[PDB]
Protein backbone atom coordinates (compact mmCIF):
# COMPACT_ATOMS: atom_id res chain seq x y z
CA UNK A 1 0.00 0.00 0.00
CA UNK A 2 0.93 3.69 0.10
CA UNK A 3 3.97 5.11 1.86
CA UNK A 4 3.57 4.65 5.59
CA UNK A 5 3.39 7.78 7.76
CA UNK A 6 2.98 10.51 5.15
CA UNK A 7 4.07 13.24 7.57
CA UNK A 8 6.01 12.54 10.76
CA UNK A 9 5.87 14.98 13.66
CA UNK A 10 9.60 14.85 14.40
CA UNK A 11 12.62 13.64 12.47
CA UNK A 12 13.20 10.12 13.76
CA UNK A 13 16.62 9.63 15.31
CA UNK A 14 19.01 6.77 14.66
CA UNK A 15 17.26 3.53 13.70
CA UNK A 16 18.18 0.43 15.64
CA UNK A 17 21.26 -1.49 14.58
CA UNK A 18 23.36 1.59 13.86
CA UNK A 19 26.86 2.33 15.15
CA UNK A 20 28.38 5.76 15.70
CA UNK A 21 31.92 5.90 14.34
CA UNK A 22 33.11 8.99 16.18
CA UNK A 23 33.73 6.86 19.26
CA UNK A 24 35.87 3.72 19.11
CA UNK A 25 33.76 1.05 17.51
CA UNK A 26 33.98 -2.41 16.01
CA UNK A 27 31.55 -4.16 13.70
CA UNK A 28 32.82 -7.63 12.80
CA UNK A 29 31.60 -9.75 9.91
CA UNK A 30 30.36 -13.29 10.54
CA UNK A 31 29.89 -15.29 7.36
CA UNK A 32 27.62 -18.05 8.61
CA UNK A 33 24.46 -16.91 10.38
CA UNK A 34 20.74 -17.57 10.74
CA UNK A 35 18.13 -16.75 8.13
CA UNK A 36 15.76 -14.06 9.33
CA UNK A 37 18.30 -12.50 11.68
CA UNK A 38 16.59 -9.31 12.82
CA UNK A 39 18.76 -6.21 12.64
CA UNK A 40 18.95 -3.84 15.57
CA UNK A 41 18.82 -6.69 18.08
CA UNK A 42 21.23 -8.56 20.28
CA UNK A 43 22.44 -11.69 18.49
CA UNK A 44 23.94 -14.79 20.07
CA UNK A 45 26.72 -17.05 18.84
CA UNK A 46 25.84 -20.74 18.79
CA UNK A 47 27.44 -23.74 17.08
CA UNK A 48 29.75 -21.37 15.26
CA UNK A 49 26.99 -19.23 13.76
CA UNK A 50 25.41 -15.87 14.53
CA UNK A 51 21.74 -16.47 15.26
CA UNK A 52 18.76 -14.88 16.97
CA UNK A 53 18.40 -14.88 20.74
CA UNK A 54 16.13 -17.65 21.97
CA UNK A 55 15.56 -19.29 25.33
CA UNK A 56 18.84 -21.03 26.13
CA UNK A 57 21.10 -21.71 29.09
CA UNK A 58 23.55 -18.79 28.86
CA UNK A 59 23.81 -17.53 25.29
CA UNK A 60 27.07 -15.99 24.11
CA UNK A 61 25.94 -12.49 23.21
CA UNK A 62 28.12 -11.56 20.24
CA UNK A 63 26.76 -8.05 19.83
CA UNK A 64 24.13 -6.10 17.92
CA UNK A 65 23.06 -6.99 14.39
CA UNK A 66 24.20 -4.02 12.32
CA UNK A 67 21.57 -2.48 10.08
CA UNK A 68 22.84 -2.34 6.50
CA UNK A 69 22.13 1.03 4.92
CA UNK A 70 22.71 -0.43 1.45
CA UNK A 71 20.68 -3.54 2.22
CA UNK A 72 17.33 -4.69 0.92
CA UNK A 73 14.39 -2.41 1.61
CA UNK A 74 12.00 -4.22 3.92
CA UNK A 75 11.89 -5.42 7.50
CA UNK A 76 15.26 -5.37 9.17
CA UNK A 77 16.16 -8.95 8.31
CA UNK A 78 19.33 -10.81 7.42
CA UNK A 79 18.50 -13.17 4.58
CA UNK A 80 20.10 -16.13 2.86
CA UNK A 81 19.18 -17.49 -0.58
CA UNK A 82 17.15 -14.72 -2.12
CA UNK A 83 17.41 -11.69 -4.33
CA UNK A 84 18.08 -10.02 -0.96
CA UNK A 85 20.82 -12.48 0.03
CA UNK A 86 23.13 -11.09 2.70
CA UNK A 87 26.52 -12.76 2.45
CA UNK A 88 27.66 -12.04 6.02
CA UNK A 89 26.01 -11.01 9.28
CA UNK A 90 27.45 -7.61 10.17
CA UNK A 91 27.46 -7.49 13.98
CA UNK A 92 28.36 -4.48 16.14
CA UNK A 93 30.42 -5.69 19.09
CA UNK A 94 32.23 -2.57 20.30
CA UNK A 95 31.23 1.02 20.93
CA UNK A 96 27.94 2.91 20.88
CA UNK A 97 25.18 1.15 18.99
CA UNK A 98 21.41 1.43 18.70
CA UNK A 99 19.22 -1.49 19.79
CA UNK A 100 15.46 -1.85 20.01
CA UNK A 101 14.03 -1.91 23.51
CA UNK A 102 10.94 -3.60 24.88
CA UNK A 103 8.00 -1.23 24.53
CA UNK A 104 7.40 -1.59 28.27
CA UNK A 105 10.99 -0.66 29.12
CA UNK A 106 11.81 2.89 30.25
CA UNK A 107 15.59 2.88 30.66
CA UNK A 108 18.08 5.64 31.46
CA UNK A 109 21.77 6.43 31.11
CA UNK A 110 24.31 4.13 32.78
CA UNK A 111 21.69 1.50 33.35
CA UNK A 112 22.78 -2.13 32.88
CA UNK A 113 21.41 -3.43 29.59
CA UNK A 114 19.32 -6.60 29.62
CA UNK A 115 18.65 -8.51 26.41
CA UNK A 116 15.51 -10.55 25.85
CA UNK A 117 15.95 -14.33 25.74
CA UNK A 118 12.69 -15.79 24.42
CA UNK A 119 11.46 -17.65 21.35
CA UNK A 120 9.23 -14.79 20.22
CA UNK A 121 9.31 -11.57 18.22
CA UNK A 122 10.84 -9.75 21.21
CA UNK A 123 14.04 -11.77 20.79
CA UNK A 124 17.16 -9.66 21.18
CA UNK A 125 15.35 -6.55 22.42
CA UNK A 126 17.02 -4.54 25.16
CA UNK A 127 15.48 -3.46 28.46
CA UNK A 128 16.41 -1.93 31.79
CA UNK A 129 13.99 -3.94 33.93
CA UNK A 130 15.70 -7.14 35.05
CA UNK A 131 12.44 -8.72 36.21
CA UNK A 132 11.22 -8.76 32.62
CA UNK A 133 10.69 -12.27 31.32
CA UNK A 134 13.86 -13.68 29.79
CA UNK A 135 16.02 -10.78 30.94
CA UNK A 136 19.64 -11.72 30.24
CA UNK A 137 22.36 -9.54 31.72
CA UNK A 138 24.52 -8.46 28.79
CA UNK A 139 28.08 -8.23 30.07
CA UNK A 140 29.40 -4.68 30.49
CA UNK A 141 26.86 -2.74 28.43
CA UNK A 142 24.88 0.32 29.50
CA UNK A 143 22.02 2.32 28.03
CA UNK A 144 23.26 5.72 26.89
CA UNK A 145 20.43 7.71 25.34
CA UNK A 146 17.02 7.29 23.76
CA UNK A 147 17.52 7.69 20.02
CA UNK A 148 14.23 6.73 18.37
CA UNK A 149 10.85 5.32 19.32
CA UNK A 150 11.66 2.11 21.23
CA UNK A 151 15.31 2.39 20.16
CA UNK A 152 18.13 3.21 22.57
CA UNK A 153 21.77 3.90 21.87
CA UNK A 154 23.65 1.72 24.31
CA UNK A 155 27.38 1.59 25.03
CA UNK A 156 29.34 -1.66 25.05
CA UNK A 157 32.17 -0.91 27.48
CA UNK A 158 34.24 -3.86 26.26
CA UNK A 159 33.83 -6.05 23.20
CA UNK A 160 30.79 -8.29 22.86
CA UNK B 1 -14.00 16.82 -16.83
CA UNK B 2 -12.71 17.89 -13.42
CA UNK B 3 -9.83 15.57 -12.47
CA UNK B 4 -6.92 17.08 -14.37
CA UNK B 5 -8.20 20.57 -13.54
CA UNK B 6 -7.95 19.72 -9.85
CA UNK B 7 -4.19 19.87 -10.18
CA UNK B 8 -3.01 16.27 -10.11
CA UNK B 9 -0.03 15.99 -12.43
CA UNK B 10 0.08 13.20 -14.99
CA UNK B 11 3.31 11.19 -14.88
CA UNK B 12 4.23 9.41 -18.14
CA UNK B 13 7.30 7.57 -16.86
CA UNK B 14 6.19 3.98 -16.25
CA UNK B 15 7.10 2.91 -19.77
CA UNK B 16 5.47 -0.36 -20.78
CA UNK B 17 6.09 -2.10 -17.46
CA UNK B 18 3.20 -3.80 -15.69
CA UNK B 19 3.85 -1.95 -12.42
CA UNK B 20 5.49 1.27 -11.26
CA UNK B 21 7.59 1.23 -8.09
CA UNK B 22 8.29 4.43 -6.18
CA UNK B 23 10.87 4.67 -3.41
CA UNK B 24 11.19 7.19 -0.58
CA UNK B 25 14.38 8.11 1.30
CA UNK B 26 14.02 9.55 4.80
CA UNK B 27 16.86 11.18 6.72
CA UNK B 28 16.89 9.74 10.24
CA UNK B 29 19.08 10.99 13.05
CA UNK B 30 19.86 14.07 15.03
CA UNK B 31 22.57 16.57 15.84
CA UNK B 32 23.81 16.36 19.42
CA UNK B 33 25.26 19.01 21.69
CA UNK B 34 29.04 18.91 21.53
CA UNK B 35 32.13 20.36 23.14
CA UNK B 36 35.33 21.66 21.63
CA UNK B 37 37.13 18.29 21.49
CA UNK B 38 34.64 15.44 21.95
CA UNK B 39 33.18 12.46 20.13
CA UNK B 40 29.76 13.08 18.64
CA UNK B 41 27.05 10.68 19.77
CA UNK B 42 24.53 11.89 17.17
CA UNK B 43 24.60 10.39 13.70
CA UNK B 44 22.67 11.36 10.58
CA UNK B 45 21.79 8.39 8.36
CA UNK B 46 19.31 7.31 5.69
CA UNK B 47 16.39 4.90 5.61
CA UNK B 48 13.95 4.02 2.87
CA UNK B 49 10.73 2.37 1.81
CA UNK B 50 8.95 1.46 -1.40
CA UNK B 51 5.49 1.20 -2.93
CA UNK B 52 4.19 -0.40 -6.12
CA UNK B 53 1.11 0.30 -8.24
CA UNK B 54 0.05 -2.10 -11.02
CA UNK C 1 8.51 -31.10 -54.00
CA UNK C 2 6.49 -30.18 -50.92
CA UNK C 3 6.41 -26.92 -48.98
CA UNK C 4 6.61 -26.16 -45.27
CA UNK C 5 5.17 -22.90 -43.96
CA UNK C 6 5.26 -21.51 -40.44
CA UNK C 7 3.98 -18.36 -38.77
CA UNK C 8 4.92 -16.20 -35.82
CA UNK C 9 2.94 -13.30 -34.41
CA UNK C 10 3.37 -10.73 -31.67
CA UNK C 11 1.77 -7.49 -30.52
CA UNK C 12 2.97 -3.98 -29.79
CA UNK C 13 2.35 -4.71 -26.11
CA UNK C 14 4.63 -7.73 -25.98
CA UNK C 15 6.98 -6.15 -28.53
CA UNK C 16 7.70 -3.31 -26.12
CA UNK C 17 7.62 -5.53 -23.03
CA UNK C 18 10.30 -7.60 -24.75
CA UNK C 19 12.22 -4.44 -25.63
CA UNK C 20 12.29 -3.84 -21.87
CA UNK C 21 14.84 -6.66 -21.73
CA UNK C 22 16.69 -5.16 -24.71
CA UNK C 23 15.24 -8.00 -26.79
CA UNK C 24 14.15 -7.33 -30.37
CA UNK C 25 11.18 -9.69 -30.51
CA UNK C 26 10.63 -9.30 -34.29
CA UNK C 27 14.33 -9.83 -34.96
CA UNK C 28 14.29 -12.75 -32.54
CA UNK C 29 11.41 -14.39 -34.43
CA UNK C 30 13.29 -13.86 -37.69
CA UNK C 31 16.38 -15.55 -36.26
CA UNK C 32 14.21 -18.36 -34.88
CA UNK C 33 12.56 -18.85 -38.27
CA UNK C 34 15.93 -19.07 -39.99
CA UNK C 35 17.28 -21.45 -37.35
CA UNK C 36 14.25 -23.73 -37.52
CA UNK C 37 14.49 -23.73 -41.32
CA UNK C 38 18.12 -24.82 -41.03
CA UNK C 39 17.21 -27.51 -38.49
CA UNK C 40 14.37 -28.80 -40.66
CA UNK C 41 16.66 -28.88 -43.71
CA UNK C 42 19.12 -30.85 -41.60
CA UNK C 43 16.44 -33.27 -40.37
CA UNK C 44 14.74 -33.85 -43.73
CA UNK C 45 18.04 -35.07 -45.13
CA UNK C 46 18.51 -37.48 -42.22
CA UNK C 47 15.08 -38.66 -41.10
CA UNK C 48 12.79 -37.26 -43.78
CA UNK C 49 9.40 -35.74 -43.06
CA UNK C 50 7.24 -37.25 -40.35
CA UNK C 51 3.58 -36.54 -40.97
CA UNK C 52 1.77 -34.73 -38.18
CA UNK C 53 -0.26 -37.89 -37.44
CA UNK C 54 2.87 -39.96 -36.76
Amino acid sequence: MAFNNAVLQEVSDLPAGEVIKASPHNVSAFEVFQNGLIEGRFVKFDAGSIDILDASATPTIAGIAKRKVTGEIGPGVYSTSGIEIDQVAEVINFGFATVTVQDAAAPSKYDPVYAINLDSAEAGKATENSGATGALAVADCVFWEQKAANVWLVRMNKFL
Amino acid sequence: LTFLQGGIVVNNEGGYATSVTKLKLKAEGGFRESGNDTNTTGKITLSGESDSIP
Amino acid sequence: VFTLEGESDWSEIELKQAELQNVNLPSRYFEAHAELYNRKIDELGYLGQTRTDG
Partner: peptide
Protein backbone atom coordinates in the same frame (compact mmCIF):
# COMPACT_ATOMS: atom_id res chain seq x y z
CA UNK D 1 14.46 0.53 9.09
CA UNK D 2 15.87 -2.14 6.81
CA UNK D 3 17.77 -0.29 4.12
CA UNK D 4 17.55 2.21 1.29
CA UNK D 5 18.21 0.07 -1.81
CA UNK D 6 15.25 -1.62 -3.45
CA UNK D 7 15.79 -5.36 -3.77
CA UNK D 8 15.58 -5.60 -7.56
CA UNK D 9 18.42 -3.07 -7.88
CA UNK D 10 20.70 -5.32 -5.80
CA UNK D 11 20.70 -7.71 -8.78
CA UNK D 12 22.40 -7.09 -12.12
CA UNK D 13 20.57 -8.89 -14.90
CA UNK D 14 23.36 -9.64 -17.36
CA UNK D 15 23.09 -7.93 -20.73
CA UNK D 16 24.48 -11.02 -22.45
CA UNK D 17 21.59 -13.26 -23.53
CA UNK D 18 22.29 -16.99 -23.84
CA UNK D 19 20.29 -18.60 -26.62
CA UNK D 20 19.23 -22.20 -26.23
CA UNK D 21 21.42 -24.62 -28.18
CA UNK D 22 20.38 -27.82 -29.93
CA UNK D 23 22.16 -30.78 -31.49
CA UNK D 24 24.44 -29.97 -34.39
Amino acid sequence: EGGIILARNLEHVSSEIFTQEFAG
